[PDB]
Every structure is written in C-alpha cells, then in structure tokens.
Amino acid sequence: SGKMTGIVKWFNADKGFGFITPDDGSKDVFVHFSAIQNDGYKSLDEGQKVSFTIESGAKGPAAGNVTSL
C-alpha cells in the first residue's frame, strides 16, 4: 500500500492549485486538478477526507492521485 490517506482543507480551481492536510503528514502539501479522481466536473469540498501519494513535479510534495474517500 504505497498510498496515504488525508483530508483537503483549501483548494482553488480558478488558479488550478490547492492545499491538502495529511493525517500522518501534519504538514501541508499543495495539490492540482491535473490528477484528481472525480470523473469530471472538477469540484471538491472544503475539509473533505481524500487520499494521495505526494507526487513530485516542482519541489517535493504535489498532489499524487487525489481521490475522495
């Protein structure tokens, strides 16, 4: 299980970026709407439980299979 569960706090669709809050990862990582898991109609809730895999593209953390629980 190379995956980690967490919850998204904030996320902007106007710019194309957001910030998630992983349980084990008390820290905060950024996410994008270019690797989500919600069919289509890009849309997410504030303070929702979602999983990921901390993907890399810029620095270190960055979305990574963002799916809603």
Q: What percent strand?
A: 35-45%
Q: Give the CATH superfamily.
A: Nucleic acid-binding proteins
Strand order of the largest sheet: 3-2-1-5-6-4
For the biggest sheet, the summary is:
6 strands, mixed
SSE ordering: EEEEEE
> Overall 3D geometry?
globular
**Whole-number tally of structural domains:** 1
Helix content: under 10%
CATH architectural category: Beta Barrel
Q: Tell me how many strands there are.
A: 6
* Helix/sheet category: mainly beta
CATH topology: OB fold (Dihydrolipoamide Acetyltransferase, E2P)
**In angstroms, what separates the terminal alpha carbons?**
16 Å
Report the total helices: 0
The CATH class is: Mainly Beta
Radius of gyration from CA coordinates: 11 Å
PDB class: gene regulation
Keywords: cold-shock protein, transcription regulation, single-stranded RNA/DNA binding, OB fold, greek-KEY topology, RNA chaperone, aromatic-base stacking interactions, gene regulation
Assembly: monomeric
Entry title: major cold-shock protein from escherichia coli solution NMR structure
Brief characterization of the structure:
The chain is mainly beta and 69 residues long.
Topology, element by element:
Elements (H helix, E strand, L loop, with lengths): L3 E9 L4 E6 L6 E3 L4 E2 L10 E5 L13 E3 L1
Parallel strand pairs: 4-6
Antiparallel strand pairs: 1-2, 1-5, 2-3, 5-6
PDB class: gene regulation
Keywords: cold-shock protein, transcription regulation, single-stranded RNA/DNA binding, OB fold, greek-KEY topology, RNA chaperone, aromatic-base stacking interactions, gene regulation
Assembly: monomeric
